[PDB]
Amino acid sequence: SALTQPASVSGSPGQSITISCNGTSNDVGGYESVSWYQQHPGKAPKVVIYDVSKRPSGVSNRFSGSKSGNTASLTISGLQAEDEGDYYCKSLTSTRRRVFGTGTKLTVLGQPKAAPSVTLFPPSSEELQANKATLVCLISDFYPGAVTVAWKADSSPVKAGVETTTPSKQSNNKYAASSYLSLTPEQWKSHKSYSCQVTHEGSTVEKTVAPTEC
């Protein structure tokens, strides 16, 4: 059974944050062999702490580790945008096995904003002939990499048939994402307009398409 971590933690640049890791007498509490790992998107994890509090060679001294009973803790001081990513704890077990924590999403806040570019394509006539329909909402060039996507049929909220990707880093070190709304041709024709709403840092950018338009 995996070790328990908080789903997410967040702080502003320069301040200190702490991630906990809860185990049992047969793992975390039983040994001084807790290690921590940092994982960036599309990357393998890199160790930042081992043996509860030891730092590997070439690891920033901003990273520190401790343990109390069944609770292990990773502390990051002087927060930086570079520190954004997933953090996993790991422990040896009494059965000579290893066990990872559920992982914690660390978000660095107060970073400089970049509004999202949103492009919305209606169903092609070809797809419509195939008795199908897909609305394609493409979101790009935004930062930080956190967005919320909502769909509207006319003025009414829609969640059915919605498929949305998690934001990923671009080559330009900004973020991009996409959302799809699957409808029937009848549903598509049944409304006067459909809207793709992208919320990002307290601001919402909305694009609209209509069956009545070409």
Partner: protein, 239 residues
């Protein structure tokens, strides 16, 4: 120190698969090795560990009796035999090295039998990983639809157009434009896995709005897992 995984692939549940890991840059015969896996958008899961001389093996409860670790020190290779595969085995699989060295006592450095490393109980080297997908879905080439440029997709001097690559399996599909002649303003988005078990993605390109109707734009979609290639011409709308 380097670790390179291979042997990953797409199979139906109940099938078999053999993962391999090529190790270099250190004495493989002296260090313990781990297999660790991570499902798409999920957390890390320790799979197995094997001692430096392979005299001891340990596997996670969730994979015991189906996945098994082994090693060949004459070829510096780590293996993971995968049998009776299940959908939940779907993940990226990492070959990982157990950090190690001598233990210190009474002013002496001690090594294990035959000078094997003692475990330092943390991972210090990771491969980039190999992909394993277990699905009941059957192979299927993509349907390519045009995402035509209109007045509602232009941004002044520039205009956006693309291709919708719909309902294919498995990953990956690759997309180029004008046979690779068009590389600027191009962006291909990651795929979505629909509830149907099939994938879809979109590829978009930004071009001069004035060039529409004069310049031809073709998206080159490539789906090797089905031996399918599609060239799609994207016509500009009059909107």
């Amino acid at each position: 120190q380097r670790l390179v995984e291979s042997g990953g692939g797409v199979v139906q549940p109940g099938s078999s698969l053999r993962l391999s890991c090529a190790a270099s840059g250190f004495d493989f015969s002296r260090q313990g090795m781990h297999w660790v896996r991570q499902a798409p958008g999920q957390g890390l899961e320790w799979v197995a560990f094997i001692k430096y001389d392979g005299s001891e093996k340990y596997h996670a409860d969730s994979v015991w009796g189906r996945l098994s670790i082994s090693r060949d020190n004459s070829k510096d290779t780590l293996y993971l035999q995968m049998n009776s595969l299940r959908v939940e085995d779907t993940a990226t699989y990492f070959c990982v090295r157990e950090a190690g060295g001598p233990d210190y006592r009474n002013g002496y450095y001690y090594y294990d039998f035959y000078d094997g490393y003692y475990n330092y109980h943390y991972m210090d080297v990771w491969g980039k990983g190999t992909t394993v997908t277990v699905s009941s879905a059957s192979t299927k080439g993509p349907s390519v639809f045009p995402l035509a440029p209109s007045s509602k997709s232009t941004s002044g001097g520039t205009a956006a157009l693309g291709c919708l690559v719909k309902d294919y399996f498995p990953e990956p599909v690759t997309v180029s434009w004008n046979s690779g002649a068009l590389t600027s303003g191009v962006h291909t988005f990651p795929a979505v896995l629909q509830s149907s078990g099939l994938y879809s993605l979109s590829s978009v390109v930004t071009v001069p709005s004035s060039s529409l109707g004069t310049q031809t734009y073709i998206c080159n979609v490539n789906h090797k897992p089905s031996n399918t290639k599609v060239d799609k011409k994207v016509e500009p709308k009059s909107c």
